[PDB]
């Protein structure tokens, strides 16, 4: 079907002629869902479009929720304690400036070689078992690590962490309430170490900077509330590069070539495979005033779908080749980490557990094989990430 549609796992495989169509006969796109007309919203395609409106928070507005469902916030019941993702300035500001404290250059330092060392234990496993499914061998426990390192949880309990882990994700993509108090009460521990212990992930350093001090219980849930943005965004997206660039990589012998002969290409074949699986596909805004793009005028106040993984895939920005890999395309202002206020705290860390697992892959598994026919996606309209990748090695 060329015809617009929020995905499903079903529709997952291959949403790009929608887009394409959409880029090309309704860049600014009416959607009027023929069972709810009221919840009528719109949908933004182009490169140009969606970077300006990403941007532009005083224009399309986070703070309604970011789904295309009206009521979301209410109904998920964040309205008194929001999360940063549905902030906007100046509240989302000085948080972000404070948590932002715990994502420097460090950070990703420290924890790549932990990266590293499971990667290559969890390839080797299924090089001696000749495959098995990279995803659930790989692909989905690696990134809960990362995030539990940047939330400053102890190694020891990041066993434990990933269990809460799995299925707040679950529950998440397309309904966890014991792993929800769970960490909420883990959290809320690990919270009150820090004042005396502090280290150098965001937790401590939200804690240093006196967030929750004093009987400050509105500034306790606030970290609460970003260890959940931070399990539920850091996990199915990452698992959503990797995954996703597998068949990319296997069905272009000539590009895998390209990186097996100069590795040091690598860093820059990620920034192409994140153009190109872009895992968080879409994410929307609220218009706070009517906005005229073109002949089409938005009215104030209702939500807009800025189609993140159609923008990556934009001819007019990435040329008529925009479909396809090209290892050497640096592509720039790629929409994946989102562009302005929001722009994704974790853009290093996805990167490096490409350029990591990238790296790895080609040098213990290249002669490897993917049916893409057989992978299965996740559920959900937002994010596009495999359950399964049936992976073979030889
Ligand atoms: C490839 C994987 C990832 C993708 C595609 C991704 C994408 C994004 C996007 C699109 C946003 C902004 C959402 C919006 O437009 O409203 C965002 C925000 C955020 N991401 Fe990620 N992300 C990834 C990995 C991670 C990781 C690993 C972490 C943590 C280590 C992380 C932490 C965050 C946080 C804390 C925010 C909120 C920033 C704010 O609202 O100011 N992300 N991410
Ligand atoms: C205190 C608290 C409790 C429960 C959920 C959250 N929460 C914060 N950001 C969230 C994002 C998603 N997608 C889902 C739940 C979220 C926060
Ligand atoms: C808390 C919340 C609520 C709703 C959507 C998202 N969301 C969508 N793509 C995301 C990517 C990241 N890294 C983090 C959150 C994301 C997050």
Redesign the pocket.
């Given at each position: 079907s060329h015809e617009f549609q929020l995905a499903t796992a079903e529709t997952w495989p291959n949403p790009w002629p929608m887009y394409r169509a959409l880029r090309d006969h309704d860049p600014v796109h009416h959607v009027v869902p023929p069972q709810r007309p009221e919840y009528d919203y719109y949908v933004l395609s182009r490169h140009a479009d969606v970077w300006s409106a990403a941007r532009d928070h005083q224009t399309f507005s986070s703070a309604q929720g970011l789904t295309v469902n009206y009521g979301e916030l209410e109904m998920?019941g964040?309205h008194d304690?929001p999360?940063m993702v549905m902030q906007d300035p100046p509240v989302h500001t000085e948080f972000r400036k404070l948590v932002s404290r715990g994502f420097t250059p460090r950070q990703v330092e420290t924890v790549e070689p932990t990266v590293r060392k499971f990667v290559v234990e969890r390839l080797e496993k299924l090089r001696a078992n000749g495959g098995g499914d990279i995803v659930t061998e790989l692909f989905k426990p690696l990134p809960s690590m990362v995030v539990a390192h940047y939330l400053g949880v102890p190694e020891e309990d990041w066993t434990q962490f990933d269990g809460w882990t799995q299925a707040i994700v679950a529950a998440?993509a397309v309904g966890a309430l014991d792993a929800?108090g769970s960490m909420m009460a883990y959290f809320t521990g690990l919270i009150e170490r820090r004042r005396t212990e502090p280290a150098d992930d965001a937790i401590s350093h939200l804690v240093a900077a006196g967030v929750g001090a004093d009987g400050d219980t509105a500034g306790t849930?606030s970290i609460?509330?970003f260890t959940?943005?931070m399990v539920?965004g850091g996990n199915d997206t990452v698992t959503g590069m990797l995954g996703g660039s597998m068949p990319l990589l296997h069905r272009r012998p000539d590009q895998r070539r390209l990186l097996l002969d100069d590795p040091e290409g690598i860093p820059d074949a990620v920034e192409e495979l994140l153009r190109l699986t872009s895992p968080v596909q879409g994410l929307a805004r609220t218009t706070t005033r009517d906005v005229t793009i073109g002949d089409t005028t938005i009215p104030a106040g209702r939500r807009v779908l800025l189609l993140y993984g159609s923008a990556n895939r934009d001819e007019r920005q990435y040329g008529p080749d925009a479909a396809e890999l090209d290892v050497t395309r640096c592509p720039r202002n790629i929409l994946t980490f989102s562009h302005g206020a929001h722009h994704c705290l974790g853009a290093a860390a996805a990167r490096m557990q490409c350029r990591v697992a990238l790296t790895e892959l080609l040098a213990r598994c290249p002669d490897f094989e993917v049916a893409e026919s057989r992978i299965v996606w996740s559920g959900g309209s937002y994010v596009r990430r495999p359950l399964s990748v049936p992976f073979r090695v030889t």
């Amino acid at each position: 079907s060329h015809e617009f549609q929020l995905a499903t796992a079903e529709t997952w495989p291959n949403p790009w002629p929608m887009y394409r169509a959409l880029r090309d006969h309704d860049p600014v796109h009416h959607v009027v869902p023929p069972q709810r007309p009221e919840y009528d919203y719109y949908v933004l395609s182009r490169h140009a479009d969606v970077w300006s409106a990403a941007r532009d928070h005083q224009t399309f507005s986070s703070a309604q929720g970011l789904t295309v469902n009206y009521g979301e916030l209410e109904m998920i019941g964040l309205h008194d304690t929001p999360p940063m993702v549905m902030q906007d300035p100046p509240v989302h500001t000085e948080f972000r400036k404070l948590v932002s404290r715990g994502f420097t250059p460090r950070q990703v330092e420290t924890v790549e070689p932990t990266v590293r060392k499971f990667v290559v234990e969890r390839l080797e496993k299924l090089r001696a078992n000749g495959g098995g499914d990279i995803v659930t061998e790989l692909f989905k426990p690696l990134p809960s690590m990362v995030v539990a390192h940047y939330l400053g949880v102890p190694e020891e309990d990041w066993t434990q962490f990933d269990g809460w882990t799995q299925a707040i994700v679950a529950a998440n993509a397309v309904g966890a309430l014991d792993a929800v108090g769970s960490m909420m009460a883990y959290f809320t521990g690990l919270i009150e170490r820090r004042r005396t212990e502090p280290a150098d992930d965001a937790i401590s350093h939200l804690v240093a900077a006196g967030v929750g001090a004093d009987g400050d219980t509105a500034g306790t849930l606030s970290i609460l509330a970003f260890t959940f943005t931070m399990v539920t965004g850091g996990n199915d997206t990452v698992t959503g590069m990797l995954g996703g660039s597998m068949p990319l990589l296997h069905r272009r012998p000539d590009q895998r070539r390209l990186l097996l002969d100069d590795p040091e290409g690598i860093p820059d074949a990620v920034e192409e495979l994140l153009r190109l699986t872009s895992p968080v596909q879409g994410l929307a805004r609220t218009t706070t005033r009517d906005v005229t793009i073109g002949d089409t005028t938005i009215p104030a106040g209702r939500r807009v779908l800025l189609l993140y993984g159609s923008a990556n895939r934009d001819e007019r920005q990435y040329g008529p080749d925009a479909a396809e890999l090209d290892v050497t395309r640096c592509p720039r202002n790629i929409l994946t980490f989102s562009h302005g206020a929001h722009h994704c705290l974790g853009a290093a860390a996805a990167r490096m557990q490409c350029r990591v697992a990238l790296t790895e892959l080609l040098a213990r598994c290249p002669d490897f094989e993917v049916a893409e026919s057989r992978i299965v996606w996740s559920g959900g309209s937002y994010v596009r990430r495999p359950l399964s990748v049936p992976f073979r090695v030889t």
